[PDB]
Amino acid sequence: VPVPTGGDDPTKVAMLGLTFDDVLLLPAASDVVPATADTSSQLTKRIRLRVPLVSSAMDTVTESRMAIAMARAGGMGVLHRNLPVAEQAGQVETVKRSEAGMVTDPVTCSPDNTLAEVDAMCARFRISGLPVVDDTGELVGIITNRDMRFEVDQSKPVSEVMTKAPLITAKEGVSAEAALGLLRRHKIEKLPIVDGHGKLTGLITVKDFVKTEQFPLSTKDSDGRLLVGAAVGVGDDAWTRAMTLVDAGVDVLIVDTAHAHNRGVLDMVSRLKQAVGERVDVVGGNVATRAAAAALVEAGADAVKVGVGPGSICTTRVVAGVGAPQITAILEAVAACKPYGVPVIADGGLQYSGDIAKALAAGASTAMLGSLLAGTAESPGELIFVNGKQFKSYRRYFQDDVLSEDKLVPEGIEGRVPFRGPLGTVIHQLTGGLRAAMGYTGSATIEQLQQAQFVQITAAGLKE
Amino acid sequence: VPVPTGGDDPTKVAMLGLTFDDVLLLPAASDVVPATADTSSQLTKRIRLRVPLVSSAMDTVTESRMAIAMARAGGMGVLHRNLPVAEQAGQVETVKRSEAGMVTDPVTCSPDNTLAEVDAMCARFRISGLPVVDDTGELVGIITNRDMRFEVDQSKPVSEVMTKAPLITAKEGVSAEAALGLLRRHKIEKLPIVDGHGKLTGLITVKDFVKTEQFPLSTKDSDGRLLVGAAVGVGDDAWTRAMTLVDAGVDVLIVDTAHAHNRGVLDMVSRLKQAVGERVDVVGGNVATRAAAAALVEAGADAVKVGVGPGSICTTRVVAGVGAPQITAILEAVAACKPYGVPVIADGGLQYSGDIAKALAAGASTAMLGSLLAGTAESPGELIFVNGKQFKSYRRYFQDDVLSEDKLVPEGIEGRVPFRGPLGTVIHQLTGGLRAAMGYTGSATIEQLQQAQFVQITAAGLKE
Amino acid sequence: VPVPTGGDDPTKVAMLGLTFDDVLLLPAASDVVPATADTSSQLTKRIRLRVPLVSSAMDTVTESRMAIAMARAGGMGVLHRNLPVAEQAGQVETVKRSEAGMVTDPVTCSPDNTLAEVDAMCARFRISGLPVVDDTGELVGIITNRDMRFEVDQSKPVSEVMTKAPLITAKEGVSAEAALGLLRRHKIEKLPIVDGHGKLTGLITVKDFVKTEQFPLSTKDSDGRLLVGAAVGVGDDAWTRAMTLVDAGVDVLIVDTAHAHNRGVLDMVSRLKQAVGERVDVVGGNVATRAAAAALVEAGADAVKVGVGPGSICTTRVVAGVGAPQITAILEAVAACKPYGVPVIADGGLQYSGDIAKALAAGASTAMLGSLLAGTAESPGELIFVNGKQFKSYRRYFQDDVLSEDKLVPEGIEGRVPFRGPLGTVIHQLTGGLRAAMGYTGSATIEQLQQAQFVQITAAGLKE
Amino acid sequence: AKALAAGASTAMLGSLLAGTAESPGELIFVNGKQFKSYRRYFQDDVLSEDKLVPEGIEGRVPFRGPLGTVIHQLTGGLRAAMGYTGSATIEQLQQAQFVQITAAGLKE
Numbered sequence A, B, C: 001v002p003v004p005t006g007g008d009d010p011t012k013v014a015m016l017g018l019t020f021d022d023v024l025l026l027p028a029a030s031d032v033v034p035a036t037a038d039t040s041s042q043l044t045k046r047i048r049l050r051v052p053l054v055s056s057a058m059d060t061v062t063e064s065r066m067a068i069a070m071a072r073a074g075g076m077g078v079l080h081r082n083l084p085v086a087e088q089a090g091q092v093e094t095v096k097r098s099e100a101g102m103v104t105d106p107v108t109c110s111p112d113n114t115l116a117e118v119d120a121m122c123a124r125f126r127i128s129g130l131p132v133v134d135d136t137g138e139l140v141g142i143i144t145n146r147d148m149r150f151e152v153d154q155s156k157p158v159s160e161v162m163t164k165a166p167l168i169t170a171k172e173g174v175s176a177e178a179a180l181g182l183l184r185r186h187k188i189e190k191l192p193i194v195d196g197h198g199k200l201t202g203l204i205t206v207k208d209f210v211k212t213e214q215f216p217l218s219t220k221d222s223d224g225r226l227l228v229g230a231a232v233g234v235g236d237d238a239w240t241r242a243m244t245l246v247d248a249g250v251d252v253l254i255v256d257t258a259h260a261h262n263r264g265v266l267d268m269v270s271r272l273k274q275a276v277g278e279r280v281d282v283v284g285g286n287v288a289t290r291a292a293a294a295a296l297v298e299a300g301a302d303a304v305k306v307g308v309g310p311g312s313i314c315t316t317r318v319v320a321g322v323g324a325p326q327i328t329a330i331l332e333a334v335a336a337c338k339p340y341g342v343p344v345i346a347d348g349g350l351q352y353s354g355d356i357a358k359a360l361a362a363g364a365s366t367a368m369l370g371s372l373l374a375g376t377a378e379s380p381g382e383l384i385f386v387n388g389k390q391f392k393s394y395r396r397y398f399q400d401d402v403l404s405e406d407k408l409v410p411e412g413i414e415g416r417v418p419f420r421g422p423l424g425t426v427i428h429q430l431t432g433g434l435r436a437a438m439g440y441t442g443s444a445t446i447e448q449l450q451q452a453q454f455v456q457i458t459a460a461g462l463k464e
Numbered sequence D: 001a002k003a004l005a006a007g008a009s010t011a012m013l014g015s016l017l018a019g020t021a022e023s024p025g026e027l028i029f030v031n032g033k034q035f036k037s038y039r040r041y042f043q044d045d046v047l048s049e050d051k052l053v054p055e056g057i058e059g060r061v062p063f064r065g066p067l068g069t070v071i072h073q074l075t076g077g078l079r080a081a082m083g084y085t086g087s088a089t090i091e092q093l094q095q096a097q098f099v100q101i102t103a104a105g106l107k108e
Ligand SMILES: Nc1nc2c(ncn2[C@@H]2O[C@H](COP(=O)(O)OP(=O)(O)O)[C@@H](OP(=O)(O)OP(=O)(O)O)[C@H]2O)c(=O)[nH]1
Pocket: A098, A119, A122, A123, A124, A126, A127, A128, A129, A145, A189, A205, A206, A207
C-alpha cells in the first residue's frame, strides 16, 4: 500500500522525467541517403518550413537581420518584444520588404527629397535605388546609387541627380523570364512596373533573381515575400502591439509567456484567433504538461511551444524549484496536440544537433534555437577585437584626457560574448546532423522521424 | 495507461541500454586454472581462432605487418580499404606469402634480374633468398643474401652472384622431418622442391620451422599459410575490389559499413555469398538491433559485427543523437544470430580486458580491437623521438636554410600518438585478463563463458 | 666604451626603477610607541591633514558621501569630474554644508513650501529641520522632522506644521558652551542665531557637537566646515568648471591629467594660481620624473602628484609601453620638490599599509587611495545580495511577464564588485600599519619617517 | 613602441597576423567558434563519422578577423607612446630614454 518513494498517494510523484541526455535514437531499416533526406516540416497548421528551425525571439538573438537570414536559410525568425511597438513594427516592415517586396507596394521618393534621405532609405531596405514620384503621382524617373556615388553635396535634391523619364518599364503581371530578359537586354538592374495609365505599381530589381538563385530554400508567403513572426504579451498594450504588427504584415503571432497555463494567456489566444485568425497564425506560450497543451489547443492555438525550465542548471529550477525535463514534456504535449494536428515547437535545452534530432523524434515539429545563434554575425550587437580575438558586445562625454587608459582599450570590453560568424554555417551544420540522424533511422521525412524509437541509457553511458 | 516516462505509446522508449561499466561477471563454481583455460573461439562458421581477437581494419591499425603479427599471435587481422585496390591486393599477397607460403607457388627470379630487384623482393617478403629460373624454365641456381652481402655494385646481374646448380633439393610431398633433417645434414637454410622432371615447384626455408616453434598458435588455412581478412564497401568499385582480393587469396571479406541495416549492404552480402561464398567467408557490417542481425543472417552472412555508436562520448551520439549501448546490442544480436550458429563480433567500446571478458560473456564469439593497437610497433606509422619519449606519427624542397628552426626539431612532431611497443605483449596482457575471468566464472571454454551471468551495478559502484 | 646593456649612449637606459616590492624599511633606534606616533602631514603648502590619506577622485570611489567620510576620518576626498558641472558643484555644496555649515549661511524654507520639498532638502543635507523665513525676510518659525513625522499628506504647506515664533535663539558670536547650555536647558536640538535686529544669521544643531565628539580628527577650513577637493581638466570647459567649483566653496583644485608634463597643463595651473590662488590650492597632475616635477613647481603648483603607470600589470605598460616604478619616481619627484617645500602625493600602486609606509618614507607627504576604497559603503554604487554574499553594483519597461527568469534574479548582478563595509575600519587598519612602521623606524612624525632608510631585496625575498 | 625607441625604423609582425582573414588558410567552424586551418577519395561511406566532422579540425589556429583592425590597434598603441614621450615623429621617438625594471615589476 505505501508508495516506495514515500507517502500513500501514488500520484504525488507524477512521472519520471527524461532529458535529452537520457535517450538515444535506435538505428532502423534505412534506404535513405542523408543528402536526399527531406527536412521540411510544419511550423503551424498552414506554414511549412524547408528547415525545421526557428530563432528564439530574444533581444540578443532575433532582429530584422536575423529574421531575414533565417527566412533565407529555410527557417523563420521571431522578433522580440523588448522594444517599443513602433520599432517592432518597423522591423517587421524591414523584413517584409527586404527581398521581392517592392513588386506591389514599392517605396518611392519625391523630387524634392535630399540625397541623404534616399541614402537612408536605401541603407534600411538594402536596395540600390528608388523610383521618383511627384506630387501629381507621376513616375518622373529613377535614382540609383550609381547616380549618387560621387556626389559630395548630400543636401542636393533628388531632381538634380535622378535619371529622367522615359524609363525601361514593364506591364503589370510581367513574368520573371520577361523581366530578366529586359534587364539583360537593356543592361540595367532595375525595372519599374506600371499600369495602363503609366502609373507606378511596382519595381523589380536584380536582387530578386540573385537571392532566388543563392537561397533556393527561402520561406515566402503567397505574395513571395519573406516570412517573419513576432512575439506579444498579455494585456492591453499587448493587444495594441498585436494589432500594429498585423497591420505591418506579420505572418505569425506568438503569445510568449513563461507559463501559458493561465486564463489570461488563453483568453488572449482566443481573442487573437477571433480577430485576426483568418490572416495570421497564433502560437501559444510555453506549456510543459498534457493538460496545458490540451487547454491551448482548445483555445484555438495553431502551434504549441513546450519548454518550461528545461535546462539542468536553470534559474527556474534553483530559485523556484519548478521544471520539467524536455523529452517527457514534448511527449506529453504531443500526446495532447497530435490528434488535432497541432504542431509542437521544442524550446530550450538544445545544445547539439543530436538534441534537435531527438526533439523531432519525440514528436515535435520544429525546434527553437536560442544561445546557439547568439554570437552569429546576423544577431544584434557590435563586433569588437580584444586580445587577438573577435567578440560581440552589447554596449567620452566628460573624459577629455587624450592619454587616459580608457582611450587605450575598446569600448564594450566588459560583457562581451564570443563571435560565431555567419548564421548559414551554423544552420548547415545542424541540418547535416539532422540528415545523418534521418539516414540512420531510415526516415525519408520528418513525419517518419517522429515515429522513431528511443533507447534509454544509464549514468555509465554519460562518462567521459 | 500513461507511460511513466511520457506519452501513451509503451514502445516509444524501446529498452534500457546497458554498457560495459553497468555490469560485472558473477563468480561461479570453478575447477578451471587460468593457465589451462582454452580461449579458442569461432570467427566465422568455418574459421576458428586460438585467441578470440581481431584487428579493427582502420588505416592507423591494420596493414600487412599488423595482419601477420595478429595471425602469429593466434587471432587475425582485417586490412583497411582506404587505399587503391592494387595496394590492398598487394598487402594481401604479402601476408599470404610471409610464412610457409612458398611451398607450392614460390617466388622466383631470373639470371637477368639485378641484385637491387632481388633485394627489394626479399625485403618485401622477408625472405633471405630466391630460386633462379631462366626463360626456358629450369632451376639454374639459388641466390641468397650471404651471396650478395658484400656486393657494392647493386646493378650486378644474378648470374654473376648466384650459386649454380646442382643444388640440394627434395622431392614433392616431403615431410617436415625429412626437410629439417636435410637442412641439418647439409647445414643450409633453404631447400628447393622439384617434381619428377626436375622443375621447380616449391621452396622450404628454416623460417618455417623457426616460426612454427616460436608461434605455436598461428592461424593458418588449408595450405598452412597465414589467415588474413580484408574490408570492402558497397558499389561497383567495391565489387571489383572484392574480386581482386579474392584473386589475391583473401580468406575473409568484411562488408564494412556504419549502418548495415540497408538494402544495398544486404544485396552486396548476397552477391558475394553467391559468387565467392564457397571459398571465402563473408562478414556483415555493424548492426545494433535484433532485426538487423536477423536480416544479415537471412542474407547469408557468416558472421555479424555489432557496434553502432558504442562509445559514451561519440561523434555519432553527439552529432546525430544515434547510438546503442554495447552490452544490450550484443545481447539482442546474439538473440537473433545464435539459433543459426552465426558468430558475433563485438566492435568498439572496449578499453580493458575486463570489457573483452564481458563482451564474450554477453554472447559474442570474438572481439575487434581498435585504439588499443594504434600505437604498437606493427601498426602503420613512423617512430619518432620527442622530448625524451617515443611517439608514432603519420606524416626540405624549398627550405634550404641549414640553420632554420625546422631543421632543429623532428618532422611530424604535430599529430603524434604514444608508442606502445610490440603487439605480443598487449595481446598477452589481454589474454591473461580473459583467462582470469574464465577461471573466476568456471568456464573451461569460450562457449561456457558465453553462459555466464551478470550483476548490474549502480552509479555508486563507479565512483573513485 | 660600449655600454654593457647595449649601444654607445650611457643615458639611453636612464636608471633602474624600484617598485614597492623591491624595498623594505630598515629598523632604527626607536623611542616611539605606535599608539602615540603623530601621523599628521601636509597635503599642500597651506593644508595639513591628521591622516595622510586622500581618496582617488574616480567615479567608483569619491562622491559627496565618500568625501564627507574621508574628511571625518582625518583625511580628505577629491570629487571626480566625470559628471556635469552643476552636479559637481552641488556635491561640493553638499560636502561644505554637512557639518557646522549652517552657522553663517543657513538653509531656509518659506511658509508656502510643501512638506515634500523640506523633506528633500533635509535628506540632501542630512539635517532634521529648517528655519522658516517669509517673503519679508523675518524668522517666523522652525520646522523639524518631529513636527512632520506622521503627516501623511506631504503636500501640506510649512505654515500648517511649523512651530511658530518666538523661538529659543542666541545672539551672534555665541560660544559653543553657551549654545550647548541653551540646548540642554530647553531640551531642544536646534538653536537659531539672530543679530541685534532679530534677523536670522545662522543655525546650530546638536549634530555639530555629536560629530565633534565622534570624529576628533576631522579636517576643517577656517570657518569650521569640512574640507573637500575637486578635479578639473584642461580647456575652456575646464575653466568654467573650475570657476563654478570655486564659487561653490571648494578648497583644493586638482588639475587631473595622465601626463602633466605638457604645456597646456602648466598653463592651466598658472592661470588657476593667478586667478584663485589666494583662496584655493592648486595641485598638478601626474608626473613621474624630476624635470616634470620641477616644471610643475615653476608653474606654481601647491602640490605635485606622481604616479604614471605605477602598476606592474597595467594598461599603460602593455598598450603604450610607458611607465615608471613608483619608488624611484617618488624619489626623483621629491628631489625636485623638496627645496621649494612643495608636498608630494603618491598616487597608484598601493596595495597594503606597508606600501603606504614605504611611499611616505621615500619622501611623499600624502598617499592617494584608489581600489582600496572602491567597495566601501560610502563609495558610489548600490548594495545587492547575491548567492549569500553582499556585492556593490553600478547599474522592467517592456518585460511585463510576472514569471520570467529576469524577475527571479537581482538587478546589477553583472559587473558587481565585492562589498567592503564601512570606510572607517579600512582607514583604521591602514593607520595602524603606518603607526607600526613609524614605531619600528623610530619616527615620531611623518617628517621623520621621510628620512628613513631602505634595504633592497632580491627576487628570492619575494618567493613564497 | 619599445623597439622603435631603441633605434629600429620598422617592425616585422609574425604571429600577430597569423590568423587574420587575409592570411593564408581556410576558415572553418568548430564547436561554435571560427578557426583557420591549413589542410573522401576512398571513404565513400555516407554515414561514417568522418562525414560528421569538418576536414582540418586538427592543426587549426584561432580566427582573428580583418587585418585592418589589428593594424589600427597597434598604431593606436604606438601613437599613445608617441604622445607620452613627446615625439612628433618616429625619428624623435628613436631618441627616447628607457627605465630598467626589476623582477618585482613583472609580478601580477
Ligand atoms: N545605397 C545603399 N545601397 C546599399 C546599402 N547596403 C546594401 N545596398 C545595396 O543593396 C543591394 C542588395 O544588398 P545585398 O548586400 O546584396 O543584400 P542583403 O539584403 O543581404 O544586405 C545591392 O545593390 P544591387 O544593385 O541590388 O546589387 P549589386 O549591383 O551590388 O550586385 C547593394 O549595393 C547601403 O547602405 N546603401
